[PDB]
A paper describes a structure:
One group of metal ion efflux transporters that regulates metal ion homeostasis and can be found in all domains of life is the Cation Diffusion Facilitator (CDF) protein family. One of the most highly conserved and abundant integral MM proteins is the CDF transporter MamM. MamM was recently proposed to function as a magnetosome-directed iron transporter required for iron biomineralization since its deletion abolished magnetite biomineralization and mutation of residues within the conserved TMD metal-binding site resulted in alterations of magnetite crystal size, morphology and even mineral phase. To summarize our results we present an alternative model for the CDF CTD mode of action, in which we propose that upon metal cation binding, the CTD induces conformational changes towards a tighter and more compact fold which allows the activation of iron transport through the TMD.
Examining this closed state model, three putative binding sites were revealed, in which Asp, Glu and His residues from the two monomers are brought into close proximity and may bind divalent cations. The central binding site is presumed to be the main site as it displays tight packing and contains two symmetry-related His285 and two Asp249 residues. The other two symmetrical peripheral binding sites contain His264 and Glu289 residues but no designated binding cavity was found. Compared to transcomplementation with the wild-type allele, single point mutations of the histidine residues at the putative central binding site (H285A) or periphery binding sites (H264A) affected neither Cmag values nor the number, size and morphology of the crystals. The D249A, H285A and H264A mutants displayed a minor increase in the number of binding sites compared to the wild-type protein, which may be the result of an increased void volume that allowed the accommodation of additional cations after amino acid substitution to alanine. Since Glu289 is located at the domain surface, it is more likely to have a role in peripheral binding site stabilization and metal ion coordination than the relatively buried His264. Fourth, we confirmed metal coordination by the His264 and His285 residues by ssNMR. To confirm that these observed phenotypic differences are due to true transport function alternations, we also examined the expression levels of all MamM mutants, their ability to stabilize MamB expression, performed MD simulations for dimer stability evaluation and determined their CTD structures. (ii) All mutants exhibited an apo-MamM CTD-like behavior along the MD simulations, and (iii) an absence of structural differences was observed.
Author numbering:
A (entry chain A), B (entry chain A): 213 to 292
């Protein structure tokens, strides 16, 4: 069920270089698939280009570890 | 009606230093009030802190020029 899977999403995101916590994570089942929407924190002094790069990195790492996720949006917000 | 008001939103955003076009703008009436959701473009080499600053700037400039707007979210995406 969901919570197990949410823990796995947060844990996978957090192991990616540049991720400063997961700020928000919304996940829902579309049948047997997961669709999710997430915000990560990032260094405020990172450039927008760097923030985008970490987001794709997170998107790839999470999709790679949790196979049932068929849609994942990752966006970023300054933190710390 | 709406389109007039959307033109005014885009025009106000675009006069703010650091705004590289309006990428997306969703506006709806909640009665006589406007609630809107917008994405601006920004220099990819700006820092996340700078991108946030321009967003607040846009939020303030648009709310100040279009009085019926009672809710406005501004977020940012690298452009050019």
């Amino acid at each position: 069920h969901m919570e197990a899977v949410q823990n796995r999403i947060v844990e996978a995101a957090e192991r990616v270089p540049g991720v400063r916590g997961v700020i928000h994570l919304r996940a829902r089942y579309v049948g047997q698939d997961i669709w999710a929407d997430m915000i990560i924190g990032v260094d405020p002094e990172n450039t927008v280009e760097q923030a985008a790069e970490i987001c794709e990195a997170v998107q790839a790492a999470v999709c790679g570890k949790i196979r049932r996720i068929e849609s994942l949006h990752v966006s970023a917000e300054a933190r710390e």
